[PDB]
Coordinates of C-alpha atoms and ligand atoms in Angstrom, one line a residue:
Chain A
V1 CA -104.5 60.2 -4.4
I2 CA -107.7 60.1 -6.7
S3 CA -105.6 60.7 -10.1
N4 CA -108.2 59.1 -12.2
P5 CA -112.0 59.3 -12.4
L6 CA -113.6 56.9 -9.9
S7 CA -117.0 55.5 -8.9
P8 CA -119.0 57.0 -6.1
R9 CA -118.7 53.6 -4.1
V10 CA -114.7 53.3 -4.8
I11 CA -114.4 57.2 -3.4
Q12 CA -116.4 56.3 -0.5
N13 CA -114.4 53.7 0.8
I14 CA -111.4 55.9 0.1
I15 CA -112.9 58.5 2.4
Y16 CA -114.4 56.4 5.3
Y17 CA -112.2 53.2 5.3
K18 CA -108.9 53.9 3.7
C19 CA -107.9 57.2 4.5
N20 CA -109.8 58.5 7.5
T21 CA -109.8 55.6 10.1
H22 CA -109.1 57.7 13.2
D23 CA -111.7 60.6 12.9
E24 CA -114.7 60.2 10.6
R25 CA -115.8 63.7 11.3
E26 CA -113.0 64.4 8.9
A27 CA -114.7 62.6 5.9
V28 CA -117.9 64.8 6.2
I29 CA -115.7 67.9 6.4
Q30 CA -113.5 66.5 3.5
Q31 CA -116.5 65.7 1.4
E32 CA -117.8 69.5 2.2
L33 CA -114.5 70.7 0.7
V34 CA -114.6 68.7 -2.6
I35 CA -118.2 70.0 -3.3
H36 CA -117.1 73.7 -2.4
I37 CA -113.6 73.1 -4.4
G38 CA -115.2 71.5 -7.2
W39 CA -117.6 74.3 -8.1
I40 CA -114.5 76.8 -7.4
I41 CA -112.6 75.0 -10.0
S42 CA -115.5 75.1 -12.3
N43 CA -116.4 78.7 -12.1
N44 CA -113.4 80.4 -10.8
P45 CA -110.6 78.2 -11.8
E46 CA -107.8 80.3 -10.8
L47 CA -108.5 80.4 -7.2
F48 CA -106.7 77.1 -7.6
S49 CA -103.8 78.1 -9.8
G50 CA -100.3 77.0 -8.6
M51 CA -102.1 73.9 -7.0
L52 CA -101.7 70.6 -8.9
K53 CA -102.5 68.2 -6.1
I54 CA -105.4 69.5 -4.0
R55 CA -104.8 68.0 -0.6
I56 CA -108.2 68.5 1.0
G57 CA -106.7 67.6 4.6
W58 CA -104.0 70.1 4.4
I59 CA -106.7 72.6 3.3
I60 CA -108.7 71.9 6.1
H61 CA -105.5 72.3 8.0
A62 CA -105.0 75.7 6.6
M63 CA -108.7 76.5 7.6
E64 CA -108.4 75.2 11.5
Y65 CA -105.1 77.6 11.6
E66 CA -107.0 80.5 10.0
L67 CA -109.5 80.2 12.7
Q68 CA -106.9 80.3 15.1
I69 CA -105.0 83.4 13.7
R70 CA -108.3 85.1 13.0
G71 CA -109.6 84.0 16.6
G72 CA -106.8 85.9 18.6
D73 CA -106.2 85.2 22.2
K74 CA -110.2 84.4 22.4
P75 CA -110.4 80.3 21.7
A76 CA -110.4 79.6 17.8
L77 CA -114.0 78.5 16.7
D78 CA -114.3 74.7 15.8
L79 CA -114.2 74.4 11.9
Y80 CA -116.7 71.5 12.7
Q81 CA -119.3 73.7 14.7
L82 CA -119.1 76.2 11.7
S83 CA -121.8 76.1 9.1
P84 CA -121.3 74.6 5.7
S85 CA -121.5 78.2 4.3
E86 CA -119.1 79.4 7.0
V87 CA -116.8 76.6 5.9
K88 CA -117.0 77.8 2.3
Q89 CA -116.2 81.3 3.2
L90 CA -113.2 80.3 5.5
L91 CA -112.1 78.3 2.1
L92 CA -112.5 81.0 -0.1
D93 CA -110.7 83.5 2.3
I94 CA -107.8 81.1 2.7
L95 CA -107.5 80.7 -1.2
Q96 CA -107.7 84.4 -1.6
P97 CA -104.1 85.6 -2.7
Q98 CA -102.0 86.2 0.4
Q99 CA -101.8 89.9 0.6
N100 CA -99.2 92.4 1.9
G101 CA -100.3 92.3 5.7
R102 CA -100.2 88.9 7.3
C103 CA -97.2 87.6 9.3
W104 CA -94.9 85.8 7.0
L105 CA -95.7 82.8 9.4
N106 CA -99.2 82.8 8.6
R107 CA -98.5 83.5 4.7
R108 CA -96.3 80.6 4.7
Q109 CA -98.8 78.4 6.8
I110 CA -101.6 78.8 4.4
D111 CA -99.3 78.6 1.1
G112 CA -97.6 75.8 2.3
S113 CA -100.9 74.0 3.2
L114 CA -102.6 74.7 0.1
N115 CA -99.5 73.8 -1.6
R116 CA -99.3 76.8 -3.8
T117 CA -96.2 77.1 -6.0
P118 CA -94.7 79.9 -7.3
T119 CA -95.6 80.2 -11.1
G120 CA -93.0 78.1 -13.0
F121 CA -91.9 76.4 -10.0
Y122 CA -92.1 73.0 -12.0
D123 CA -90.2 74.3 -14.8
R124 CA -87.5 75.9 -12.3
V125 CA -87.2 72.5 -10.5
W126 CA -86.2 70.9 -14.0
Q127 CA -83.6 73.6 -14.5
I128 CA -82.2 72.7 -11.1
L129 CA -82.2 68.9 -11.9
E130 CA -80.7 69.6 -15.2
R131 CA -77.6 71.3 -13.6
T132 CA -77.4 68.8 -10.6
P133 CA -75.4 65.4 -11.5
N134 CA -76.7 63.3 -8.5
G135 CA -80.2 64.9 -7.8
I136 CA -82.0 66.6 -5.0
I137 CA -83.1 64.9 -1.6
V138 CA -86.0 66.4 0.2
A139 CA -87.4 64.7 3.3
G140 CA -86.1 61.4 2.6
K141 CA -87.3 61.5 -1.1
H142 CA -84.9 61.8 -4.2
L143 CA -85.6 63.5 -7.6
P144 CA -82.4 61.8 -9.5
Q145 CA -81.3 63.4 -12.5
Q146 CA -82.0 59.9 -14.5
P147 CA -84.5 58.1 -15.2
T148 CA -86.6 61.7 -15.1
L149 CA -84.1 63.8 -17.3
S150 CA -84.0 60.9 -20.0
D151 CA -87.6 60.0 -19.9
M152 CA -89.1 63.6 -19.4
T153 CA -89.3 67.1 -21.0
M154 CA -89.2 70.4 -19.2
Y155 CA -93.1 71.2 -19.4
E156 CA -94.1 67.6 -18.8
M157 CA -97.0 67.3 -16.5
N158 CA -95.7 63.9 -15.4
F159 CA -92.6 66.0 -14.0
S160 CA -95.0 68.4 -12.0
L161 CA -96.4 65.3 -10.3
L162 CA -92.7 63.9 -9.7
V163 CA -91.6 67.4 -7.9
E164 CA -95.0 67.1 -5.9
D165 CA -94.2 63.5 -5.0
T166 CA -90.6 64.6 -4.1
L167 CA -91.9 67.2 -1.6
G168 CA -94.7 64.7 -0.4
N169 CA -92.8 63.6 2.5
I170 CA -92.6 67.6 3.9
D171 CA -95.0 67.0 7.0
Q172 CA -94.8 70.6 8.0
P173 CA -96.4 73.1 5.6
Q174 CA -94.3 75.9 6.6
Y175 CA -91.3 73.7 5.9
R176 CA -92.7 73.1 2.3
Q177 CA -93.0 76.9 1.7
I178 CA -89.3 77.4 2.9
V179 CA -88.3 74.3 0.7
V180 CA -90.2 75.7 -2.2
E181 CA -88.5 78.9 -1.5
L182 CA -84.8 77.3 -1.3
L183 CA -85.8 75.6 -4.8
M184 CA -87.0 79.2 -6.2
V185 CA -83.5 80.7 -4.9
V186 CA -81.6 77.7 -6.3
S187 CA -83.1 78.3 -9.6
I188 CA -82.2 82.3 -9.5
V189 CA -78.4 81.6 -8.3
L190 CA -78.3 78.7 -11.1
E191 CA -79.8 81.0 -13.9
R192 CA -78.4 84.4 -12.9
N193 CA -74.9 82.4 -12.6
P194 CA -74.5 80.1 -15.4
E195 CA -71.0 78.8 -14.3
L196 CA -71.8 77.2 -11.0
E197 CA -73.2 73.5 -10.9
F198 CA -73.9 71.1 -7.9
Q199 CA -71.2 68.5 -7.3
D200 CA -72.9 66.2 -4.7
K201 CA -76.6 65.7 -4.1
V202 CA -78.3 68.7 -3.0
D203 CA -80.1 67.9 0.3
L204 CA -82.5 70.5 0.3
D205 CA -83.2 70.1 4.2
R206 CA -79.4 70.7 5.0
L207 CA -79.6 73.9 2.9
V208 CA -82.5 75.0 5.0
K209 CA -80.9 73.8 8.4
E210 CA -77.8 75.9 7.5
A211 CA -79.8 79.1 6.7
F212 CA -81.9 78.7 9.7
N213 CA -78.7 78.2 11.8
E214 CA -77.2 81.3 10.3
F215 CA -80.3 83.1 11.2
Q216 CA -80.2 81.5 14.6
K217 CA -76.9 83.1 15.0
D218 CA -77.5 86.4 13.6
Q219 CA -80.7 86.8 15.6
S220 CA -79.0 85.6 18.7
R221 CA -76.4 88.4 18.1
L222 CA -79.5 90.9 18.1
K223 CA -81.3 89.4 21.4
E224 CA -80.4 86.0 22.0
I225 CA -83.7 84.0 21.7
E226 CA -83.4 80.7 24.0
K227 CA -85.9 78.9 22.0
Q228 CA -83.8 76.1 20.1
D229 CA -84.8 74.2 16.6
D230 CA -87.8 76.5 16.8
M231 CA -88.0 78.1 13.2
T232 CA -91.0 80.2 14.1
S233 CA -88.7 83.2 13.9
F234 CA -87.3 82.2 10.7
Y235 CA -90.7 81.6 9.0
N236 CA -92.0 85.2 10.2
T237 CA -88.9 86.8 8.5
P238 CA -90.2 88.3 5.2
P239 CA -88.7 86.5 2.2
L240 CA -86.9 89.7 0.9
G241 CA -85.7 92.5 3.3
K242 CA -82.8 93.6 5.0
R243 CA -81.8 90.2 6.4
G244 CA -84.8 88.0 5.2
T245 CA -85.0 84.2 4.5
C246 CA -84.0 84.6 0.7
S247 CA -80.6 86.0 2.1
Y248 CA -80.0 83.0 3.9
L249 CA -80.9 80.4 1.4
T250 CA -78.9 82.1 -1.3
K251 CA -75.9 82.1 0.9
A252 CA -76.2 78.4 1.8
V253 CA -76.9 77.6 -1.9
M254 CA -73.8 79.5 -3.0
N255 CA -71.4 77.9 -0.4
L256 CA -72.3 74.7 -1.8
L257 CA -72.0 75.5 -5.5
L258 CA -68.8 77.3 -4.9
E259 CA -67.3 74.4 -3.0
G260 CA -67.2 72.7 -6.7
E261 CA -65.7 73.5 -10.1
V262 CA -66.7 76.8 -11.8
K263 CA -66.9 75.9 -15.5
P264 CA -65.5 78.5 -17.6
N265 CA -68.6 79.6 -19.6
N266 CA -68.5 81.1 -23.1
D267 CA -71.8 83.4 -22.9
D268 CA -69.5 86.1 -20.9
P269 CA -65.9 84.5 -21.3
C270 CA -63.9 85.9 -18.4
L271 CA -61.8 88.8 -18.7
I272 CA -59.7 86.5 -16.0
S273 CA -59.2 82.9 -17.1
Chain B
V1 CA -45.5 109.5 -13.9
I2 CA -44.6 110.9 -17.3
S3 CA -48.3 111.6 -18.3
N4 CA -47.4 114.4 -20.9
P5 CA -44.6 114.7 -23.5
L6 CA -41.4 116.1 -22.0
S7 CA -37.9 117.4 -22.9
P8 CA -34.9 115.1 -22.8
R9 CA -33.5 117.2 -20.0
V10 CA -36.7 117.0 -17.6
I11 CA -36.8 113.2 -18.4
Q12 CA -33.2 112.8 -17.3
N13 CA -33.6 114.5 -13.9
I14 CA -36.8 112.1 -13.6
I15 CA -34.3 109.2 -14.1
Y16 CA -31.3 109.9 -12.3
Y17 CA -32.2 112.2 -9.6
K18 CA -36.0 112.4 -8.9
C19 CA -37.0 108.7 -9.2
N20 CA -33.6 106.6 -8.9
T21 CA -31.7 107.9 -5.9
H22 CA -30.6 104.2 -4.4
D23 CA -29.1 102.5 -7.4
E24 CA -28.6 104.2 -10.7
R25 CA -27.7 100.9 -12.6
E26 CA -31.8 101.0 -12.4
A27 CA -31.8 104.1 -14.7
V28 CA -29.6 102.6 -17.3
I29 CA -32.0 99.3 -17.4
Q30 CA -35.1 101.4 -17.3
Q31 CA -33.7 103.5 -20.0
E32 CA -33.2 100.1 -21.9
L33 CA -36.8 98.9 -21.4
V34 CA -38.4 102.3 -22.6
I35 CA -36.3 102.0 -25.9
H36 CA -37.4 98.4 -26.4
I37 CA -40.9 98.9 -25.2
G38 CA -41.3 101.9 -27.4
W39 CA -40.5 100.1 -30.6
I40 CA -42.7 97.3 -29.3
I41 CA -45.6 99.7 -28.8
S42 CA -44.9 101.3 -32.0
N43 CA -44.7 97.9 -34.2
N44 CA -46.6 95.3 -32.0
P45 CA -48.9 97.5 -30.1
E46 CA -51.0 94.8 -28.7
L47 CA -48.1 93.1 -26.6
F48 CA -49.1 96.1 -24.4
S49 CA -53.0 95.9 -24.2
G50 CA -54.4 95.8 -20.7
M51 CA -51.7 98.1 -19.9
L52 CA -52.4 101.8 -19.6
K53 CA -49.6 102.8 -17.0
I54 CA -46.4 101.0 -17.8
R55 CA -44.4 100.7 -14.9
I56 CA -40.7 100.3 -16.2
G57 CA -39.5 99.7 -12.4
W58 CA -42.4 96.9 -12.3
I59 CA -41.7 95.3 -15.6
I60 CA -38.0 95.1 -14.7
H61 CA -39.3 93.1 -11.5
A62 CA -41.2 90.7 -13.6
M63 CA -38.1 90.2 -15.5
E64 CA -35.7 89.5 -12.4
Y65 CA -38.4 87.1 -11.1
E66 CA -38.6 85.3 -14.7
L67 CA -34.8 85.0 -14.5
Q68 CA -35.4 83.1 -11.2
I69 CA -38.4 80.9 -12.2
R70 CA -36.5 80.2 -15.4
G71 CA -33.2 79.7 -13.3
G72 CA -34.6 77.0 -11.0
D73 CA -32.3 75.9 -8.3
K74 CA -29.4 77.0 -10.1
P75 CA -28.9 80.6 -9.2
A76 CA -30.8 83.2 -11.4
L77 CA -28.7 85.3 -13.7
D78 CA -28.3 88.9 -13.1
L79 CA -30.6 90.9 -15.2
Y80 CA -27.7 93.4 -15.3
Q81 CA -25.2 91.0 -16.9
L82 CA -27.7 90.1 -19.5
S83 CA -26.9 91.7 -22.9
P84 CA -29.1 94.7 -24.3
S85 CA -30.7 91.9 -26.4
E86 CA -31.1 89.2 -24.0
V87 CA -33.0 92.0 -21.8
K88 CA -35.2 92.6 -24.9
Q89 CA -36.0 88.9 -25.3
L90 CA -36.6 88.6 -21.5
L91 CA -39.1 91.6 -22.0
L92 CA -40.6 90.0 -24.8
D93 CA -41.2 86.8 -23.3
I94 CA -42.9 88.3 -19.8
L95 CA -45.1 90.5 -22.3
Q96 CA -46.3 87.0 -24.2
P97 CA -49.8 86.3 -23.3
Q98 CA -49.5 83.8 -20.3
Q99 CA -50.5 80.3 -21.5
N100 CA -51.6 77.3 -19.7
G101 CA -48.4 75.8 -17.9
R102 CA -46.8 78.3 -15.4
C103 CA -47.6 78.1 -11.7
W104 CA -50.5 80.5 -10.9
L105 CA -48.2 82.4 -8.8
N106 CA -45.8 83.0 -11.7
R107 CA -48.7 83.7 -13.9
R108 CA -50.1 86.4 -11.2
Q109 CA -46.7 88.0 -10.5
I110 CA -45.9 88.5 -14.1
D111 CA -49.5 89.9 -14.9
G112 CA -49.5 92.0 -11.6
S113 CA -46.2 93.3 -12.4
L114 CA -46.9 94.2 -16.0
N115 CA -50.3 95.6 -14.5
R116 CA -52.1 93.8 -17.1
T117 CA -55.9 94.1 -16.5
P118 CA -58.6 91.7 -17.9
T119 CA -60.4 93.5 -20.9
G120 CA -63.2 95.7 -19.6
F121 CA -61.7 96.1 -16.1
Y122 CA -62.3 99.6 -16.1
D123 CA -65.6 99.7 -17.2
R124 CA -66.4 96.7 -14.8
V125 CA -65.0 98.8 -12.0
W126 CA -67.2 101.6 -13.0
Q127 CA -70.0 99.2 -12.7
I128 CA -68.9 98.3 -9.2
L129 CA -68.8 102.1 -8.2
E130 CA -72.1 102.7 -9.6
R131 CA -73.7 100.2 -7.6
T132 CA -71.8 100.8 -4.4
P133 CA -72.9 103.8 -2.2
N134 CA -69.8 104.6 0.0
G135 CA -67.2 103.3 -2.6
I136 CA -64.2 100.9 -2.8
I137 CA -61.0 101.3 -0.4
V138 CA -58.0 99.3 -1.7
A139 CA -54.4 99.6 0.2
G140 CA -55.4 103.0 1.8
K141 CA -57.0 104.6 -1.3
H142 CA -60.7 105.1 -1.9
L143 CA -62.6 105.5 -5.3
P144 CA -65.5 107.3 -3.8
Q145 CA -68.9 107.2 -5.8
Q146 CA -68.9 111.1 -5.8
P147 CA -67.1 113.2 -7.3
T148 CA -66.3 110.4 -10.1
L149 CA -69.8 109.2 -10.8
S150 CA -70.9 112.9 -11.1
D151 CA -67.8 114.2 -12.9
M152 CA -67.1 111.0 -15.2
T153 CA -68.8 108.4 -17.6
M154 CA -68.3 104.6 -18.1
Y155 CA -65.6 104.5 -20.7
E156 CA -63.9 107.7 -19.6
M157 CA -60.2 107.6 -19.9
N158 CA -59.8 109.8 -16.8
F159 CA -61.8 106.8 -14.9
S160 CA -59.3 104.3 -16.1
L161 CA -56.5 106.4 -14.7
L162 CA -58.5 106.9 -11.3
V163 CA -58.9 103.0 -11.1
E164 CA -55.2 102.7 -11.7
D165 CA -54.5 105.2 -9.1
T166 CA -56.5 103.5 -6.5
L167 CA -54.8 100.4 -7.0
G168 CA -51.5 102.5 -7.0
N169 CA -50.8 101.7 -3.2
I170 CA -50.8 97.8 -3.9
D171 CA -47.0 97.2 -3.4
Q172 CA -47.2 93.4 -3.8
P173 CA -47.8 92.7 -7.7
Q174 CA -49.5 89.3 -6.9
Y175 CA -51.8 91.0 -4.6
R176 CA -52.6 93.3 -7.6
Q177 CA -53.8 90.5 -9.5
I178 CA -55.9 89.0 -6.5
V179 CA -57.3 92.7 -6.1
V180 CA -58.0 92.8 -10.0
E181 CA -59.6 89.5 -9.7
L182 CA -61.6 90.4 -6.7
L183 CA -62.9 93.5 -8.7
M184 CA -63.6 90.9 -11.6
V185 CA -65.5 88.5 -9.3
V186 CA -67.5 91.7 -7.9
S187 CA -68.3 92.7 -11.5
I188 CA -69.9 89.2 -12.3
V189 CA -71.6 88.9 -8.9
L190 CA -73.2 92.2 -9.3
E191 CA -74.1 91.9 -12.8
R192 CA -75.3 88.3 -12.7
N193 CA -77.3 89.4 -9.6
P194 CA -78.9 92.8 -10.1
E195 CA -80.7 92.8 -6.8
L196 CA -77.5 93.0 -4.4
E197 CA -75.7 96.2 -3.7
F198 CA -73.0 97.2 -1.4
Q199 CA -74.2 98.9 1.9
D200 CA -71.1 100.3 3.5
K201 CA -67.5 100.9 1.7
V202 CA -66.2 97.8 -0.1
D203 CA -62.6 97.2 1.5
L204 CA -61.2 95.2 -1.4
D205 CA -58.3 94.1 1.3
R206 CA -60.7 93.0 3.8
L207 CA -62.8 90.9 0.9
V208 CA -59.2 89.3 0.1
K209 CA -58.3 88.6 3.7
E210 CA -61.6 86.8 4.3
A211 CA -60.9 84.9 1.0
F212 CA -57.5 83.7 1.8
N213 CA -58.6 82.9 5.6
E214 CA -61.2 80.5 4.3
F215 CA -58.7 78.9 1.8
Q216 CA -56.2 78.9 5.0
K217 CA -58.9 77.1 7.0
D218 CA -60.0 74.6 4.0
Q219 CA -56.2 73.7 3.2
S220 CA -55.4 73.3 6.7
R221 CA -58.3 70.8 7.0
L222 CA -56.5 69.0 3.9
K223 CA -53.1 69.0 5.3
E224 CA -52.3 71.8 8.0
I225 CA -49.6 73.8 6.3
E226 CA -47.8 75.9 9.1
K227 CA -46.8 78.9 7.1
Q228 CA -48.7 81.7 8.5
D229 CA -50.2 84.9 6.7
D230 CA -48.2 83.6 3.5
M231 CA -50.5 83.8 0.7
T232 CA -48.1 81.9 -1.8
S233 CA -50.6 79.0 -1.5
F234 CA -53.5 81.1 -2.3
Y235 CA -51.7 82.7 -5.4
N236 CA -50.7 79.2 -6.6
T237 CA -54.5 78.0 -6.5
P238 CA -55.9 78.3 -10.1
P239 CA -58.4 81.0 -10.3
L240 CA -61.3 78.7 -11.6
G241 CA -61.0 75.1 -10.6
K242 CA -62.5 72.6 -7.8
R243 CA -61.4 75.1 -4.9
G244 CA -59.9 78.0 -6.7
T245 CA -59.3 81.4 -5.9
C246 CA -62.6 82.8 -7.6
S247 CA -64.8 80.7 -5.2
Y248 CA -63.3 82.2 -2.1
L249 CA -63.7 85.6 -3.4
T250 CA -67.3 85.3 -4.9
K251 CA -68.2 83.8 -1.4
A252 CA -66.8 86.8 0.4
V253 CA -68.5 89.3 -1.7
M254 CA -71.6 87.5 -1.4
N255 CA -71.3 87.4 2.3
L256 CA -70.9 91.1 2.4
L257 CA -73.8 91.9 -0.1
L258 CA -76.2 89.6 1.6
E259 CA -75.9 91.3 4.7
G260 CA -77.7 94.2 3.2
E261 CA -81.2 94.9 1.8
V262 CA -82.0 93.0 -1.6
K263 CA -83.7 95.4 -3.6
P264 CA -86.8 93.7 -5.1
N265 CA -86.0 94.1 -8.8
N266 CA -88.4 94.3 -11.9
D267 CA -86.5 92.7 -14.7
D268 CA -87.3 89.1 -13.2
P269 CA -89.9 90.1 -10.5
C270 CA -90.0 87.3 -7.7
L271 CA -91.9 84.5 -8.0
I272 CA -91.8 83.1 -4.5
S273 CA -91.6 86.4 -2.2
Ligands
FAR1 C1 -87.6 85.9 -6.0 C2 -86.3 85.8 -5.5 C3 -85.1 86.4 -6.1 C4 -85.2 87.6 -6.9 C5 -83.6 85.9 -5.6 C6 -82.9 87.0 -5.0 C7 -81.4 86.9 -5.2 C8 -80.5 86.5 -4.2 C9 -80.6 86.4 -2.9 C10 -79.0 86.4 -4.8 C11 -79.1 85.4 -6.1 C12 -77.5 85.3 -6.5 C13 -77.1 84.5 -7.6 C14 -75.6 84.5 -8.1 C15 -78.2 83.8 -8.4
FAR2 C1 -64.3 85.5 -14.9 C2 -65.2 85.5 -13.8 C3 -66.3 84.8 -13.7 C4 -66.8 84.1 -14.7 C5 -67.0 84.9 -12.3 C6 -67.4 83.4 -11.8 C7 -68.5 83.6 -11.0 C8 -68.8 83.3 -9.8 C9 -67.5 82.9 -8.8 C10 -70.2 83.2 -9.1 C11 -70.7 84.6 -9.3 C12 -72.1 84.5 -9.0 C13 -73.0 85.7 -8.9 C14 -74.3 85.6 -8.3 C15 -72.8 87.0 -9.4

């Protein structure tokens, strides 16, 4: 993670020795994307908004996948054979605001791989941590309420990096988009409903597994798909729609929240105590 | 139902011939409560707020129950042996705002029997009918969206009477308090969450049965109570608390609402969508 300005010779060890030890063709492509992304950050800064940690390896992954989705049955072209400029247009195309059209499996793989976050994701994760006593555990990482709530403020950039570190261990990029969506749903449930508050630690993976398992069960009732622990169907389901991904997650979060005390709140005092 | 001013001689048929044909000792006690309630309405009008249809037979029932809860193991005194004034103090005591202390089975039996409604119950039932296309069915009655939405306005007194007629067939008074609570919960879920809207008719009895069955299952996991279809435990559970009645009902309503389209809403357009 180059978090601070570094020398050409330190940056070179990071690319040819410290990070890429399996394929060095990756270091040339990653060097190609830093040059392309750097001018894109300078002249078109907003093609990279909602991105705070630009994972060049993950952005290259989004590009290899875009070549496969674009490719169709015909074999996908090798990003490596593509010309420096063709690699820049692939990047510019993947960075383009995902529009109505692509499979929601492709939208998720690109957004998750680019690590794009809905606006206010970081502020919304603060609001989830403020109303959760024991913290959020995602992919074996844990944002505990303290020392973060005590040492940080809502819009602190340091927090955005802690949220990004917490979601660091999410290996699969489409899972990062579902975890980013559970967190966006948990923020709407918590904000829309001010009475509910988490008792134990929120395991974002378990809320996602529970949502997929409900989807698995409901889709099974439609047509009994026999693929198991394959979330491809779940990822393709649109976020909002008749039975979309956002329903399953809201349900899971609400079952967890409702298993705990409902604090009587004064903003809209109950008409029933 | 005496909805309009009537003569002493018409009121007399209503009490000794038309309504009480099984025990006429009931007509003397009901006559006793109209005299007591009538001065209470005149001088202390708010001991009867949240009450629009004063069911004297149901209010006498609340009083016979208060004598049993007050009685303890020792046999409950016969309301009929009680002196006219002792019957007025029993009434004044049952009408007193239920305070923190009594079993939530007793709070419910008194409130349900007095037909007390949380403030704005009637306005909140309009809001449930406005966002439910095919209406609410309770105890074999149905508040359909039309002709009521078309012919009535939110604060119309005519609507309060239609809501009270719909909840008319609820024989058991504690069930009326749970149905009044499901309706209060459905109003908080619908209001807090503006995107969710009911697809089919809301059967308030089915939402209550599904909440009791979840409670039955969870309490069974604690201690396996063998009483079946006995809602006494559910009624005693406090409305809001660690696992209270309001959680089960919110859950049931949310499962029904989330089984339908989530209308994308513009007040807080989706950030992750
Ligand atoms: C962009 C995402 C949303 C607009 C959230 C959709 C809302 C729900 C699935 C129900 C939320 C319910 C609560 C009680 C908070
Ligand atoms: C007097 C009653 C209440 C204060 C309602 C309690 C709230 C819930 C049980 C959760 C509601 C959730 C929504 C998304 C509307």
